[PDB]
Design a protein around this ligand. Structure first.
Ligand code: 118
Ligand code: 118
Ligand code: 118
Ligand code: 118
Ligand SMILES: [Zn+2]
Ligand SMILES: [Zn+2]
Lengths: 275, 275
DNA sequence: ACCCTCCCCTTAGGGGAGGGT
DNA sequence: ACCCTCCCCTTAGGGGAGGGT
């Protein structure tokens, strides 16, 4: 006849008093006997074995609440249980692994923004392909455009990436605009990350890309009086070197800070493909 | 000038009112203006952009609490952040993957208990190798043995597997015992699962195995009056067919139910290797 | 129809006091 | 020394009422 003080138990089955104390109250693991005089908790050498399954269970991560009926069942039962437990583990797994990738996609995209060497002048390079989706921007000028203008397409991205548009886009025609009001938005995208089956795409959105062609682009930080010049100087550029234009302009925007705390600024990126 | 009702916001950035309502209270995302007459919440088309990072952040799984200083930083900052976030994801990952395996080890071991075809008689087969650890059972007889007798070795297993001893063992000498008191425990193990570096092993425990040799074993459900016969009949067996003994007996125990609710019973497994 | 608030639920405990063996 | 209790903390909200536009 071996009987134990709660201490002993907690020392024996590495456990916190408060833990077991509340396991008693959880009714999962009550002591073999409470001294109705001193409210003290005493357990029997028997009991301990019960502590295994819970340790286990809690290890895996199953609410004590479930651990409740968890005990009751016998082997062929618990076995299936334990497997159900694996379909679970085996689930969250590949879920996150995704993110893992997902981010590693984002990051790269991020760094490639900082890696811009010429802030303010034309950059001309070899770019990669852009899985993106847009709608046709019915009327909206760079002066019109909002965010509420994004809803749908947004609702969509997150619905197939979990991750929202960090990047914001719209395309527009290539012309020697006199003014800003001289240009009105064509299509307005969002960059897609996942290569998963984007389905349920309501036909109002098209699903395509920015090819892996040549680009003559330039970046900066938006400023009204700014934006324009930069576009101007873009125009000049091609017009000068005379290169052959092959798409529209991809002025794409991304914020630099996300702080409510202050004045929102962001980096801009008008780019044009050419051959 | 576009201004929105909380509804709109919740409809626009797929979000729950209560969510944002509490984001305001969290002070993360407060409205652009609260009607000091009607306490109504109004946001600006500006704001929304702020909602991205949080959606994102909450997506990844970062307490809003952290999301707090999360915003404030600028790119080269947030970028590193986002990576720290990946060391995290990239962490929990391989952690669980482990379990995944760990269990798939257990399960198999489990099923191999149900797959016992002859409950009550001798089974003779080709077995696999057993990474296990034990101590030398100083005196303890099958009559002595407890659980408190396990502590250490137990403390250890969980400390290197997360998972506790589902299986319980002890070895003992091979002899034609007259009685139960005629046998006293030699070594008393616990089966090790992980193939990881079990270190800090205080020299009081040895780390070895049950080989992949031949076994003449039998199982059942313990019962005092029982246990004995079964051992007896084991003895008989070898003595009869005359096979050559090569180790000690591995009577190993495992419970069948873990329910506090009732009378604890368990399946037993005296096994002997022979050539 | 929308919004706003106040309230009371939802895990698994942990720290810390406050008195008693 | 140990135990026991009572209490008040710890996320991210969600349902539901209760009255007001
Ligand atoms: C000899 C053996 C056990 C008890 Sb106890 C007990 C009493 C006071 C303080 C600690 C332990 C006991 C149990 C029920 C009724 C009266 C006394 C006792 C026995 C087994 C398990 C736990 C406690 C007393 C004498
Ligand atoms: C009218 C319409 C949109 C913008 Sb703006 C903007 C707003 C604040 C600070 C900086 C820029 C904008 C317009 C053209 C090109 C780049 C930015 C704007 C951007 C995203 C979402 C909503 C408005 C500006 C005036
Ligand atoms: C024209 C444009 C805006 C407001 Sb309003 C407002 C008032 C009552 C109910 C809903 C909106 C406003 C704001 C501050 C002080 C007085 C009136 C308002 C404007 C921009 C953003 C949010 C609300 C009023 C008239
Ligand atoms: C004295 C010492 C240990 C056991 Sb038992 C045991 C206890 C209750 C119900 C069934 C068995 C036991 C002894 C020899 C072989 C198999 C089981 C026993 C088992 C594990 C831990 C503590 C005691 C029995 C009497
Ligand atoms: Zn078009
Ligand atoms: Zn020895």
């Amino acid at each position: 006849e071996s009987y134990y003080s709660i201490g002993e138990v907690s020392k024996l089955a590495n456990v916190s008093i408060k833990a077991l104390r509340y396991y008693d109250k959880i009714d999962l693991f009550k002591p073999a006997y409470v001294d109705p005089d001193t409210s003290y908790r005493y357990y029997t050498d028997s009991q301990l074995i019960h502590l295994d399954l819970i340790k286990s269970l809690k290890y895996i991560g199953t609410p004590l609440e479930e651990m409740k009926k968890a005990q009751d069942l016998e082997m062929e039962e618990l076995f299936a249980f334990y497997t159900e437990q694996e379909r679970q583990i085996r689930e969250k797994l590949d879920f996150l692994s995704a993110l893992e990738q997902t981010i590693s996609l984002v990051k790269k995209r991020m760094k490639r923004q900082m890696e811009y060497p010429a802030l303010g002048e034309v950059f001309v390079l070899d770019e990669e392909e852009i899985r993106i989706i847009q709608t046709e921007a019915e009327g909206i000028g760079p002066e019109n455009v909002l965010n509420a203008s994004y809803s749908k397409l947004k609702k969509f991205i997150e619905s197939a990436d979990g991750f929202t548009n960090n990047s914001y886009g719209a395309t527009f025609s290539f012309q020697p605009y006199t003014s800003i009001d001289e240009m009105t938005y064509r299509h307005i995208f969002t960059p897609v990350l996942t290569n998963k089956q984007i389905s349920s795409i309501t036909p109002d959105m098209e699903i395509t890309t920015i090819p892996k062609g040549r680009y003559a682009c330039i970046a900066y930080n938006f400023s009204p009086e700014h934006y324009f010049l930069n576009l101007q100087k873009l125009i000049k550029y091609i017009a000068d070197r005379q290169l052959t234009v092959v798409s529209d302009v991809y002025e794409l925007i991304i914020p630099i800070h996300y702080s409510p705390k202050k004045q929102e600024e962001y980096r801009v990126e008008m780019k044009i493909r050419i051959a």
